[PDB]
Ligand binder design. Sequence first.
Ligand code: ADP
Ligand code: ADP
Ligand code: ADP
Ligand code: ADP
Ligand code: ADP
Ligand code: CRN
Ligand code: CRN
Ligand code: CRN
Ligand code: CRN
Ligand code: CRN
Ligand code: MG
Ligand code: MG
Ligand code: MG
Ligand code: MG
Ligand code: MG
Lengths: 359, 359, 359, 359, 359
Amino acid sequence: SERRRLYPPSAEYPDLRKHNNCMASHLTPAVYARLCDKTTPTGWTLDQCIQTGVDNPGHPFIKTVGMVAGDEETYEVFADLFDPVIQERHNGYDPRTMKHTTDLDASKIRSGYFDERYVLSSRVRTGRSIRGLSLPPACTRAERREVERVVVDALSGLKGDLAGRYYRLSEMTEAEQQQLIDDHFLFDKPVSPLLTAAGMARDWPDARGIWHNNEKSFLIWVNEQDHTRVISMEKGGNMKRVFERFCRGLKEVERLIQERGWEFMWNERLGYILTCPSNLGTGLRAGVHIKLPLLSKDSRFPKILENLRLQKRGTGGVDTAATGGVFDISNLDRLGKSEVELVQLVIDGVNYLIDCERR
Amino acid sequence: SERRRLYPPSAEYPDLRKHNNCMASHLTPAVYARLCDKTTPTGWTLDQCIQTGVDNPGHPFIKTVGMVAGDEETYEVFADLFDPVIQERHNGYDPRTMKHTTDLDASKIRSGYFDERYVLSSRVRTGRSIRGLSLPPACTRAERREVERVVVDALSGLKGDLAGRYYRLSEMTEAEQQQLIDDHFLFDKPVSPLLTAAGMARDWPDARGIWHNNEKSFLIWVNEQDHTRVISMEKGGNMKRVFERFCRGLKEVERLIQERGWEFMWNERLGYILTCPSNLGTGLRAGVHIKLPLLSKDSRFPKILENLRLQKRGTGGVDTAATGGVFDISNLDRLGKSEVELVQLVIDGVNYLIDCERR
Amino acid sequence: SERRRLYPPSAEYPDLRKHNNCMASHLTPAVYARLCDKTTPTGWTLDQCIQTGVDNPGHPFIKTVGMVAGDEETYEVFADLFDPVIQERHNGYDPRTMKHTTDLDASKIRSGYFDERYVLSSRVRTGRSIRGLSLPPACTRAERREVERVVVDALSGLKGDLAGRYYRLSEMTEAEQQQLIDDHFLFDKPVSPLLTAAGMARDWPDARGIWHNNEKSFLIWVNEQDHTRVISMEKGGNMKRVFERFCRGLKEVERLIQERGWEFMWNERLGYILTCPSNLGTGLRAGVHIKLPLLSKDSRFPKILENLRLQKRGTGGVDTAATGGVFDISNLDRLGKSEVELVQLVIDGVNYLIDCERR
Amino acid sequence: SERRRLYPPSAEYPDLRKHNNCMASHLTPAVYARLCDKTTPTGWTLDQCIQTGVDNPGHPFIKTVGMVAGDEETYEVFADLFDPVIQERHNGYDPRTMKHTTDLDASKIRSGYFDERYVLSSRVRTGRSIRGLSLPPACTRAERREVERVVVDALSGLKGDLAGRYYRLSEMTEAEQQQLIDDHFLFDKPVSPLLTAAGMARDWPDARGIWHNNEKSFLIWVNEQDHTRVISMEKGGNMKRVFERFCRGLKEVERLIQERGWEFMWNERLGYILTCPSNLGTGLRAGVHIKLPLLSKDSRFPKILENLRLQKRGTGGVDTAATGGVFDISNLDRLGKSEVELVQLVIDGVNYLIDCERR
Amino acid sequence: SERRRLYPPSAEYPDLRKHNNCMASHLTPAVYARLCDKTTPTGWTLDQCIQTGVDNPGHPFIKTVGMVAGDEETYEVFADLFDPVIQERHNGYDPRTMKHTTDLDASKIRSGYFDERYVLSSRVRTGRSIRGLSLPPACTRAERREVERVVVDALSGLKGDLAGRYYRLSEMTEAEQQQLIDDHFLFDKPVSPLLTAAGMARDWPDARGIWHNNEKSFLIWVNEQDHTRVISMEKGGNMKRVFERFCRGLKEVERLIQERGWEFMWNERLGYILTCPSNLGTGLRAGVHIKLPLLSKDSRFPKILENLRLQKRGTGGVDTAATGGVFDISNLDRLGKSEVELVQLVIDGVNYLIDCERR
Ligand SMILES: Nc1ncnc2c1ncn2[C@@H]1O[C@H](COP(=O)(O)OP(=O)(O)O)[C@@H](O)[C@H]1O
Ligand SMILES: Nc1ncnc2c1ncn2[C@@H]1O[C@H](COP(=O)(O)OP(=O)(O)O)[C@@H](O)[C@H]1O
Ligand SMILES: Nc1ncnc2c1ncn2[C@@H]1O[C@H](COP(=O)(O)OP(=O)(O)O)[C@@H](O)[C@H]1O
Ligand SMILES: Nc1ncnc2c1ncn2[C@@H]1O[C@H](COP(=O)(O)OP(=O)(O)O)[C@@H](O)[C@H]1O
Ligand SMILES: Nc1ncnc2c1ncn2[C@@H]1O[C@H](COP(=O)(O)OP(=O)(O)O)[C@@H](O)[C@H]1O
Ligand SMILES: CN(CC(=O)O)C(=N)N
Ligand SMILES: CN(CC(=O)O)C(=N)N
Ligand SMILES: CN(CC(=O)O)C(=N)N
Ligand SMILES: CN(CC(=O)O)C(=N)N
Ligand SMILES: CN(CC(=O)O)C(=N)N
Ligand SMILES: [Mg+2]
Ligand SMILES: [Mg+2]
Ligand SMILES: [Mg+2]
Ligand SMILES: [Mg+2]
Ligand SMILES: [Mg+2]
């Protein structure tokens, strides 16, 4: 009969004593019990949200979040757990009291030029989901293929310097993909436990690819970690030009996507909705590489970085260490501030770092 | 299991880039997604509402609405889409803030006499639904037959000059129906794509007919485009008399219909509920034919017509062009203003047109 | 409460006294009552099946069926009504006792050459549905677009003489489409009441097009009346060559469609499932045009045609009359016999007609 | 409404053109469509069954199955797909026509002694599930903890030479676990994509451990890849003694588990139910290491191995290559034959290999 | 969501290692798992059936069954567990292969007279349920009151020597009830754990009472342990007369109960349905007291008793020991054999015991 009893929520509670994710810092038995039975309309559950954080006590190179979203409803169905995490992840930003404003106008940028001797590369990046389609962690094969078709068709309409063709991973050979990776264009097959535990590596490489303009200064990653990933790169230190191309291409892509009736996932309290709560808000991760020896003279590096709200990864990916001195220095926060604001902050921070080389 | 995913709403969104209906001007992906799952208690869905507008980019002779209603709940279940369309269709009339008043008293009419040399014919028209019965676009065979029986029985009680018999289309021969059509009494079999796409031509001619008084000055169309269509005609220019007969017969029909327990569909925010949102409000389309050469001297005709809120169709139906000069000039708006007001407006407008003949 | 009563089935029964479809000849109140409540898993109902036959008493040029299918389940959910109709439509073929065999090998063809002076054109045709997708009468916009994408992608893999590109109707201009029509390649916009009543003209021209090889001797119609329509044409009388190309291209298309995981709708009792029960079985309609005066010497034409199981339409479509003498003479039955058998029958019949010209 | 359509099954079908699992060799669109909607009572779906095979085209060292089970119902709910795979995996064994017999009596063993100079190590292994508890691929945290408690309590009752204590992975230090691994006692953290794709690495290391007797000749792995894994090891070539201890301890464990009311999952058609269909039947993988140079003189090794139904992995795990010559040679089939039969087959095969060293 | 898992059946399995009921001898984890979810239409579950046996390892004076029924469906809903227990309880009587015959004709009795010096008292007893009313273990207050009213009204119609009035326990004083108890007429308040664990003591003494004829030779117990308990007593050894009165009164009670439309629970495979499976079949427990010293000369008493299928309780109830020598000797089996057969067996057995006094 219905007299049969279920396992009490505490019987399922994760053992997070040794873990260090930002999820474990905020998952309490009360919250887990509250959300144990809920679910998003597509079947996403809390356990699926917190699985990746549960499996990984921490990351060797940078503090993580520990949870991913399955669709747009997750950020509201499971808000009670997420909002404290989003607040902690983005320094002092309540995701239930204040709103988020997005400005993609590069005309307001200042300076934007780095000492080419010290910065080498200049990149900007973002991401965009498609409403009505499950996010990569939870998306089925059909949903992923639908995302791929929508973006491929929409991007086919781009004209001018932002013109190219879409190369599907299933077509590229190992050598070509490896060359694109080593060139810092393509994305790597997901082997990190933080991605495979979240479910973002199912059915690889099906329905995933890259669309890059002829000069490869404007790239789009389809179905790697997010639905979309709009990158603009230029080997140099003219952040202004790369950012200008990035925003122009972003506006064009948005136009050509809405022309077909689709719309990018978005809500006022959060901005563009992305899988990992780290990327919430603007998704923007404007940043540069750095000449090794010039910035290799750094004693209190992490303290200054934290003061400047800058992340320090390795040249080769977040999952790699910095060798020789080349530090992939990017911005930390993505939500709350606007894209122009974040890029100006990155410009000021990197210029400050250059001024502090003091060889 | 239930893990199977549905086609996202955008995957169904219509391709209305080239269309020009008033539906396409107001259907946005947000609205379509919102109403994608809803339905009226009888099974009417949004796609069924917008199908006719989807199929027809536009009409060669006059701007259209593009959607039809299935029953009375449609105007509330799918209000989010309709209300902007009703507002645009009837110049500046919010269907969710202001109310509608109906006055069917011809004693307040003034003048009402046209120059017979220039107007030829004088007609008034309206329509009336029956509560509890699905509208023609969605009505089943049994519902249509029930409507026919209700109106036939109720109208059988009419006495006096408004006295006649009901001729069922299934009984009339081709010659008789053709003569009535060419005489401007009967209605034509639905062949226009704007009607067949809406579903108002199923099971033709079953359960449809005409009831005309002995002098044919008072006609009722049963189950052609609406449940009811109460027309009063007189070959001449005495709009006052035709309108007086129209309102008197309308009151008598209403009385004899309520006597049996039925009631005409009606709500304060909209007035009498009719299929095509063009006819909402009063359903009244008082108008006249016109002598050709006298009004054939017109240079800026459409501008003056739009100024006077008058529609210009052809002598033979909205689906026909005006040849020789005979312009079927009627009123445009039906909701917001009262029947007496609309008829007085038509009188003033047509008299103004006559005064502007200036041969 | 639930004490409320529904309209009895007889209250909905269609008035088919004057109609002449093959549906009306077999729809009885018992059958209508039995299937009144049933439905296919996708929502297809009996009334939707019989609507087109209800609306059209008959066709001016050839006897019709009167019903269409919504998906593959319809032929089993509503079998009680269909099977007598399929039996009558295809002379003496029970669709519930005997099986259907399909053979698409042109190597077994004999003769295959006509007197070019008398036949002019040589065409073969068929159709193919996609499993899991609703048929054109019932298909939604998303389903139609999915069909279009599946066939476009699959056909893109064709190589050799069967090589071309897919032209979408939304792209072709009016002049180009008209030229293709008059050339007997493209299909006409649906205006016939027998098609618009069935619902096969919704959302026109969205998601519909034609893929023709470079020489246009191999064409595919996407989303006009069926999911697929594989035509092979050659202006001449070498039926053998056109049929060989037709079958080879059909096999290649099937291969390239299954490569992606899809499959053509098919069951042993019926063969390939198509919308109009006339086309059930093989869908094959091999036939030729005819020189006018040579076959204009015919006294008892319909009797001989019925003897030979050949249909006689007009040069320009089934919805047109034969003028000058050019008679579009094709085969009647499609189910029960195999494609090779039907084509050999057409060859023998047309050769017999030529032998009977007897000028 | 319910008129909304689902993604057709083919729209979800995996792209297995390049894959080489035994799953892809037998997954057809018909089967996938048939089982697309089904599910086991605990929520296991077909996509979850085939995910691991989908993600991995193949394994570098040995042919795989490609699917895992979620519970005991999976082998019946999804039988249509599994049974051909089980038939192929275990040479010519229909899992729906013939039955399986298990005999765990070592008294019937013959010889059982190897040339210690050539075999080094002698091990036997198996596995056992617990009825009512979800298998590791699908098990929740509470279910895994319940399994751990059941086995820990039951095994606590063992007495005699089969006496020890249970060490929980969460307690062991990195050095101790590494030493046990290198000693060939403990299991390695799951990093192989064939295990992480299946979901058998969630919540690691929670609720997992090893129970080994004082001499470590009898080990039990709790919650690594199966519920249970009963290994008996002895550095030498006396397979008879190790197998005797293995079967005696297995019988004792079964007794002490049923004493508490639990029961090992088991059905006649399949024997003990285990996750990977490779291990179905008896779970037994009796096998030995081998001296390198003595068997390094091998030309047509794989042909003889296939003739002898023996698998050849590396000394260090299936996920490692054989270096120096030490070949981890085990038995292939597990279902159909009995444990005594399989062990005798391994004995004969390894003795044959020794006789064929022919230095 | 529904992903939450229930406690596996084994997690609920009772700990019956030390118990000795006939339930524990036949409850296996397979059976418990099978019936874990089932239930009778009134909500009776297996756990409720086996609770009393679980709580009581055994009875000090006689072997028990360990389970009770909640209604008539229990013996079919939970037949898998009961049937072996009924088979063991009633020596060699399958409750699913053979049928039961009831004969209540005392005219076929022989002898029926005991040596008054050795037997003292002569009693017969039975019980009868009311169809449609839950049995005492599961009955609610309203159901118990309904049973009481039905039996009181039906018995009010008795006339002749079987004539009396019904005394309600709520009306009797402590002294009167105690005197009736010590006189061996009334029943004792339930304090034995074997009754209170079953739930047959709820709401005591509400809705329970005794109806005894004027001479108290015919008594009926209402709502003590069963719905009905029809006892006939006579201080003496004329079993024939007491049994004759018992059967006559039973027939009269049955008649007067069916007159009102009710019916005694009964099925062919089991006979009259009673709570404790010990009483199944006829419910008959004809038996006598015994003079102490005459039968106090007994060495192998239990062996002879088991040979003769006779139970030996104490003078004062089954929950009391036999002191002085007065042994309440009754019959054991109730199902399979008929009432006349059982009474003749008791007569023969007690006469045999008297013959074996051999003082
Ligand atoms: N500033 C940069 N210049 C050049 N390449 C970059 C830069 N930032 C990231 N990349 C490239 O992106 C890939 C992975 O980026 P990652 O560190 O994961 O950032 P994100 O998550 O924003 O993509 C690597 O191949 C790396 O070469
Ligand atoms: N003023 C008029 N005089 C005569 N006939 C008219 C007039 N207005 C409309 N009709 C008749 O109405 C029929 C269709 O009119 P239509 O344009 O559909 O107006 P409505 O939509 O109000 O019916 C035609 O057959 C036409 O003869
Ligand atoms: N034998 C033929 N030769 C040339 N054109 C043909 C032939 N048969 C059909 N057509 C063309 O097909 C179009 C419509 O064909 P239709 O009569 O509807 O046959 P189907 O239903 O098989 O398509 C017309 O434009 C017509 O020109
Ligand atoms: N015959 C053997 N002798 C010694 N160690 C073994 C033997 N077989 C397996 N192992 C040990 O088992 C571990 C993994 O075994 P694996 O190849 O996964 O087999 P299984 O799947 O049966 O556990 C390794 O650490 C390996 O050292
Ligand atoms: N042969 C008998 N003579 C007198 N009283 C009896 C006899 N058998 C039973 N009783 C009375 O029945 C009561 C309980 O009997 P019990 O052992 O429960 O038998 P049952 O289960 O058939 O009622 C006691 O109070 C006892 O006095
Ligand atoms: C690197 N990140 C960001 C994070 O989780 O903090 C990934 N989600 N992979
Ligand atoms: C002519 N009209 C009015 C309209 O749609 O605007 C019809 N609904 N047919
Ligand atoms: C011409 N046909 C065939 C038929 O219906 O008989 C169409 N279904 N349109
Ligand atoms: C090594 N195996 C066996 C197999 O899948 O064939 C695992 N299931 N991991
Ligand atoms: C004495 N009995 C009989 C039995 O359970 O065996 C009771 N059910 N109380
Ligand atoms: Mg990255
Ligand atoms: Mg009209
Ligand atoms: Mg055609
Ligand atoms: Mg292993
Ligand atoms: Mg008793």
